[PDB]
């Protein structure tokens, strides 16, 4: 059928860019409400307000609550109806900028996307995921947009702890290998069609981006430091993996990813570590070779990303709630059954169980 | 500096796709006017309705004069504001594309691009070419925004004369010379930055398409006909070479089309067909191995573009004539100076006499 | 679901392997019924008879009617009730087998096929086509079982026409194309499941030896002599391709065969010739590269098969013809189906008007 | 002189294809004797009743003694009498599987072939071997037909101990090498004549299946789940090695097998862990590469097979015993005089003492 690729219709990336965030936001509206996450806002504010100010624009700040639910964005619709505001910007987080592209949409005008850390594709793709307040998922919203501008300060992601730059190595390291798996079966990407070259060279571009600059962008993370290998891997946990997943596809990875989530042990480590575990419990599931496992084992292991279920902290039950991950993956619509040939709950149990053994030989041999 | 990289918020492409254009349509506006090419609205104009009232949209259909003018954008001006339109659609070659892309602008509403022939980059571009209404260079109308939505239906393209699919792969041939050229000076591009990772990996899939699916695509495009590899080429014509030009960046393949513009002989030849001669120019003045200008040499020749200057008609006072093609491509503010270190015009003069030998030796080795 | 191999329980092959019949033979029966072909009856009959009777066995030897048709294997089931024999024998060509095949189904006795020529892939197979009296298609009768036994010997088959060998060398050329195309779509086989890996290594096995040994093969076939290269080929053409068919899938290759017997034009042509043009309609519609197309179209030209619908005697009308072959091609239940993502009349057209430029191209090349 | 290549009519490999026995093997017989191991029986009894009864058969069950003796087969052939039975089921271990063909052979009935550990190349030969009631080798009885149907449950396989399945990767693991060996000698095979090449790329392809899956499919064996490693490594030591080693050819790895038996310290290992050592020693006598020899050390350990005498319980007058081994293996009629240039006595008293000497010192370089 027809072949689709969406994309932001701006993506800058750049080190101190938060200064020059006035000048790159003027062209889209004069009033504007920032949705800020709190930490963020803590040493970042008086920034924030003085790059709008020298661009002579129009702003208005309110803190992020915490969680992207209905609550939140309807505290904000109303705070936005009040500040009469043209635009909406999100600084901070994944879920801070999931709530701001959600606001954005019910308010009908663009929005800003300006990732303070490198953790999970969220920036760029067309899409929120909405929670309760209890921290559970509660519904996809689809977007008809992706957002006007994506603008990544590089020197602000170095500032964040290092461990929130491997989370979205976990989470771009899956782009190339769940896109390539649709591509072999022929599966509908959330694009709306099938996949494009374009998206699929971004997608494997993720993936060697990472094999080549991972280790090297951990060290100036740690460091908190900006260097090229830093900024390649900026690019490749926000842009290519964006890119690569909403136009590209998802498979067995994300769906294993959200039956970790279901069961509580695991349930507060972040996004792309658990999909870290995901992809090579994906490996095991479409038989890749040996030495693809152990180059994906290996750089998940350098970068600290967890490769057994005990570094998840599941550790007593296992097979009893590798049970309950394999079924909630294998639910109605899950991305599992875009898969060549489809997985059962039965092949995802085996998948889940072997790739766990495989970390732990992983691990021993290199104790 | 900051790294940017601009695109089309979607690219749709498929078989039969003007069918299911309303319902593609739909989310940006309820109201549409359509400047149409005049050859185009014939074969069309009955589907293209047929497809915006089954998906409940006004439309209203206001026939391109055929020059991209400021009076031809005036007169749509007028026709917009009296029609009450909330979006703009284009649907012809890249002069009805530009011009749509400029009413919209200029109107403050969404445009749509749908490219009848794979001929040019234009379609996903954030700029208009203005020409007075006789056909001569009027000035660049640098836009703010891509278009929100570029639609290809391949069989319309596959119906269209094979010379002009041609013209496109002269086009997109250039994409990864001119963007590897940029990066290798580290000259800014278009979208306002230095060069991205995912610009230059999309400009060489580029090339590599061309290299890989032309040959076969020009079969297709000769018996008119829709095949994997006529798909692939279209891609690689409209969306890499598009996002690959603009934000990858130009240099003196560009540059040298515009100094064939200023010789009255070459006017009667595409605008891919000048690139294709100016892409060889640049690898002669960058002075690329000999095994990559044969590459180039022999694809161009391959599918039927010019690689001498008597194929553009070019036969008389040839030195002459290159004094004001180099003098006009090094003229202030060309790409051409986005070369390592720069060229002057006897270097481009020297590179376009030696590329023209190099084209009469390749032919005459070749029977 | 389920992985399955079929094969026959004995296959044989060897020069003057016909001497040495009745003693492979009579492990099966003591009383035997042949099948076989007139033309060979005329000059082996005496050299069968000896066979059996030198190991003391029974002999009853009835002339096959030259179609495979119900009142035909009606006729010879009545012969065999009064023959009370405990086995059959096909001696012949695919006509005489798959009717051996089809009486020994219905009498429910074991089967023996001695191939005369190595011209398709029918001699293992667990099915037989049936024909009305004229020659027309009636109706797949899928057998239960593989012939208990196949001998092919060696020598008879050199001294057939060069031509049925290169008939053969194009039926088996499309094997590894057709199964690889189900391995990658996970279509069912003839054998009831999914492609196991002896299939696949079979039938890739089969692609590699005609490439290897198609030529010098071709070589002995014209000298009516045996080499060892003639003795792979005559393996690959009736085991590996037999099994590999059968076991593996079949796809475009076969479905645009199929759709070449309705046009009255190609009526002459055997049918592994027609099978040759359909591999490279198949090789056009996956897109495959262009060394894979030239490599499969030079060994077929290298060995008389045709490259373009002219060498099939089509010539006129080719546009109106060929919309006859897609359609029949892509009609329910036929084997194009199991291409990746399917494929539609118009692709199918579109393929086999594009594969004819193909092979004019190379032919003009080639001179 | 002739080449030949036999092989089971229908071989079936699946997951929880226990539930569909009855469905496949309905088409046979109506009436069905069940040999089955006891601790097969001991879970599976009630599912296998049920498979016949839901496709309306009819089965008898005689749980199997232990041993493929003339005693048990003919304690057997008086219940199948009785029983008045039209086919024979095997279900269980090798031991289960000769028993099993050995009766149908007797009984004059087709046999089906249910493998539930992937232990021997046993399942698909058409050979059974015949013991005393005191596990000593009795005879060879040559058949002559495979079976009519080999049907492997993966799942139950996987559930049965991984020592199992690495000793069917110590039988599997030796047919190439006997194969390659036998090709080199001109020697004929089980089958009756010379190799094929079907069978030579069955047997290589045996061989790269084990190095690629093999450690791959012990994870999965070890926590008793099915993945796609496991499920090839059951197909190549099921129908590779099988059709591998009856066409293929056996040499030094099989008789040096046997002459192991003969010591009273490694009687009681299993068959594939007395193959593994042969392997180890054919490759001293044949002189195969270091890189060789160190590849397959290193997954004959990596799965837990015997690389020493010592893990034979072989630890005392070892000189004195691989005495015995090598006279029992160069006995008259023995496969090692399928070795190019045959092998003495003297020869292979050498090759074991240096395999011997050569796993030793594998196995200090590894701790
Ligand atoms: N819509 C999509 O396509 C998509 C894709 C992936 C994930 N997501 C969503 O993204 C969310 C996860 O985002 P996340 O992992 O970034 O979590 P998050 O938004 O909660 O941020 C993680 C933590 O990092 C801290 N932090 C942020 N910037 C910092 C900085 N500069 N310095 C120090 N600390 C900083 C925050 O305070 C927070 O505690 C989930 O809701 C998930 O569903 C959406
Ligand atoms: N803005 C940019 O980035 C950019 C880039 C490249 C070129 N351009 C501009 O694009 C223009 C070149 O456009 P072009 O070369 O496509 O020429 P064009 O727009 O004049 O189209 C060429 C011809 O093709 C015909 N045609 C279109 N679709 C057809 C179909 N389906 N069947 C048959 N005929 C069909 C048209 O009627 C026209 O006569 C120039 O103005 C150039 O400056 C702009
Ligand atoms: N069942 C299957 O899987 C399968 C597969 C492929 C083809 N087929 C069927 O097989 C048939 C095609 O058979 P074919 O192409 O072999 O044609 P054919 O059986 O008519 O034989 C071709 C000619 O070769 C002659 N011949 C045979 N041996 C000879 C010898 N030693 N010397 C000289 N002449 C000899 C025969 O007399 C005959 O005239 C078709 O019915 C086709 O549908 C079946
Ligand atoms: N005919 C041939 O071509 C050929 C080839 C190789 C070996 N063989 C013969 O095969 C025999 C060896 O077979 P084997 O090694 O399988 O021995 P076996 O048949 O005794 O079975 C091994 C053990 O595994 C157990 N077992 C079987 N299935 C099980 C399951 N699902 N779960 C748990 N335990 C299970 C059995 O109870 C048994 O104790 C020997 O007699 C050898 O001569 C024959
Ligand atoms: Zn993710
Ligand atoms: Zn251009
Ligand atoms: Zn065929
Ligand atoms: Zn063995």
């Given at each position: 059928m027809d072949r689709i690729?969406?994309?932001?219709?701006?993506?800058?990336?750049?080190?101190?860019?938060?200064?020059?965030?006035?000048?790159?936001?003027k062209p889209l509206a004069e009033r504007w409400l920032v949705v800020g996450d709190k930490f963020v806002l803590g040493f970042a504010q008086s920034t924030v307000e003085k790059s709008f100010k020298d661009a002579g624009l129009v702003v208005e700040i309110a803190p992020f609550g915490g969680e992207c639910s209905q609550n939140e964005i309807d505290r904000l619709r109303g705070i936005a109806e009040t500040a009469q505001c043209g635009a909406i910007l999100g600084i901070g987080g994944g879920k801070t900028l999931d709530t701001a592209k959600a606001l954005a949409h019910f308010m009908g005008v663009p929005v800003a996307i300006a990732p303070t850390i490198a953790s999970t594709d969220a920036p760029c793709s067309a899409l929120?995921?909405?929670?309760?307040?209890?921290?559970?998922?509660?519904?996809?919203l689809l977007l008809p947009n992706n957002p006007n501008m994506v603008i990544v300060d590089t020197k602000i992601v170095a500032g964040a702890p290092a461990?929130?730059?491997?989370?979205?190595?976990?989470?771009?390291?899956?782009?190339?290998?769940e896109a390539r798996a649709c591509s072999r079966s022929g599966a509908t990407?959330?694009?709306?069609?099938?996949?494009?070259?374009?998206?699929?060279?971004?997608?494997?571009?993720?993936?060697?981006?990472?094999?080549?600059?991972?280790?090297?962008?951990?060290?100036?993370?740690?460091?908190?430091?900006?260097?090229?290998a830093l900024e390649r891997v900026i690019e490749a946990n926000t842009y290519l993996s964006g890119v690569g997943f909403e136009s590209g596809g998802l498979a067995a990875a994300h769906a294993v990813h959200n039956g970790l989530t279901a069961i509580p042990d695991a349930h507060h480590y972040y996004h792309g570590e658990k999909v870290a575990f995901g992809t090579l419990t994906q490996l095991v599931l479409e038989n890749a070779p040996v030495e693809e496992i152990e180059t994906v084992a290996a750089l998940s292991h350098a970068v600290g990303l967890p490769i057994?279920?005990?570094?998840?902290?599941?550790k007593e039950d296992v097979?009893?709630?590798?049970?309950?991950?394999?079924?909630?993956?294998?639910?109605?619509?899950?991305?599992?059954?875009?898969?060549?040939?489809?997985?059962?709950?039965?092949?995802?149990?085996?998948?889940?169980?072997?790739?766990?053994?495989?970390?732990?030989?992983?691990?021993?041999?290199?104790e």
């Open positions: 690729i969406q994309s932001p219709g701006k993506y800058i990336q750049g080190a101190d860019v938060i200064n020059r965030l006035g000048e790159y936001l929120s995921v909405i929670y309760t307040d209890e921290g559970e998922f509660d519904r996809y461990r929130l730059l491997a989370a979205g190595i976990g989470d771009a390291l899956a782009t190339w290998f990407t959330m694009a709306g069609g099938k996949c494009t070259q374009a998206a699929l060279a971004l997608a494997e571009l993720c993936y060697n981006t990472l094999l080549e600059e991972g280790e090297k962008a951990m060290l100036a993370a740690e460091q908190h430091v900006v260097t090229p057994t279920l005990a570094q998840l902290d599941i097979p009893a709630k590798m049970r309950i991950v394999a079924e909630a993956a294998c639910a109605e619509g899950e991305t599992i059954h875009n898969m060549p040939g489809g997985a059962t709950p039965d092949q995802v149990y085996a998948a889940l169980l072997v790739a766990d053994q495989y970390g732990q030989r992983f691990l021993q041999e290199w």
